[PDB]
Design a binder for this molecule. Sequence first.
Ligand SMILES: [Ca+2]
Lengths: 80, 168, 168
Amino acid sequence: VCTAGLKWYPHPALIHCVKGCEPFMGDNYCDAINNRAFCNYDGGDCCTSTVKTKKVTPFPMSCDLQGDCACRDPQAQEHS
Amino acid sequence: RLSLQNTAEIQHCLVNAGDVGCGVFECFENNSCEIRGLHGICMTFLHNAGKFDAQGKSFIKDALKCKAHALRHRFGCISRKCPAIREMVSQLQRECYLKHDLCAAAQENTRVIVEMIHFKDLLLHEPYVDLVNLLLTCGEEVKEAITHSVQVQCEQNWGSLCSILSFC
Amino acid sequence: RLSLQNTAEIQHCLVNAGDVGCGVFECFENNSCEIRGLHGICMTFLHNAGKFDAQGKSFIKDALKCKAHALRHRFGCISRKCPAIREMVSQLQRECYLKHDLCAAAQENTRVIVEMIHFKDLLLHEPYVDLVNLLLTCGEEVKEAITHSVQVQCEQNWGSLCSILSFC
Ligand SMILES: [Ca+2]
């Protein structure tokens, strides 16, 4: 919404498009892209306590269970 | 001819293993019926689903879920004979593939599936046989690429045997 | 990549086991090179040697003698590489079959040679592949009968796979 100062607010230069996360949140598939605070940390697919199966399967399995596919949700009991 | 203890342990695995993952098809391996590669199917295609596009990932997840769920549910009062087991496994595979549009997803990723398919894999297991049989029925360009690939690896591992079997 | 102790035991065979009889070919099996079926080759052919006619018996005796003698003598400077082993074995098979007139015995015992060939054994072992390759160039009627037989067993053992491989 442009203000009265003849400048766009928020400024388009300050705004940028970042690749989003896949619709795989909450599918029990722990992919690194969805495992972010931006989208519910993959809906809990990357934390064992959060996933409804109570076991995390990385997608693909080559992803390290302690790397980007590790439980990144602080609210999870594993972080506690 | 499947052993009764084998039947008990497979049904225990199925009631224990969830829909997602290789757990359903992991126990199905090492059975008396010698239908192998199911664990290999899950392992390799979950390796390579990332190489598949987004629609490919959706299709592969849907197909894995369909296979696990249906093969668990319909594993009921089938006779002890292995040929019936192989027939129903092939039927479930083809049913999940047709209901989840294997053909177009394969068309979008012909090169990837060419990469996974191996001459030894088709020589060893009937599941991959069913997959490639349906693949040759999923698009003229797709079937042509699959034929080229299978000829390449078949002649690589067979030499003149592949040519003499492929008469014309 | 053949094992050195395997080389020692196989040369102990050749220096001890006489050419007449399958014992030489008995212990060629279980090698690291996985070139199998020589046990099956010699057992099957000597079992069916009686079914072979007098010319067939003469040919099979001559071919067995040639195979034993040549594989004993030419097993010298051959490299440790298993593909080289298979390659020289193929040349020995070809020579023994061509200079002992296999094709005429094929005409005289078309039904018999159809009887021995089993699709599983053809798939498993290279020497049967070499035999059928030479069979398809040992007589129009014989090659036609061999193609019909291999198609029959191929279909009955592989389902639609046989038509999948046989585009034509
Ligand atoms: Ca996910």
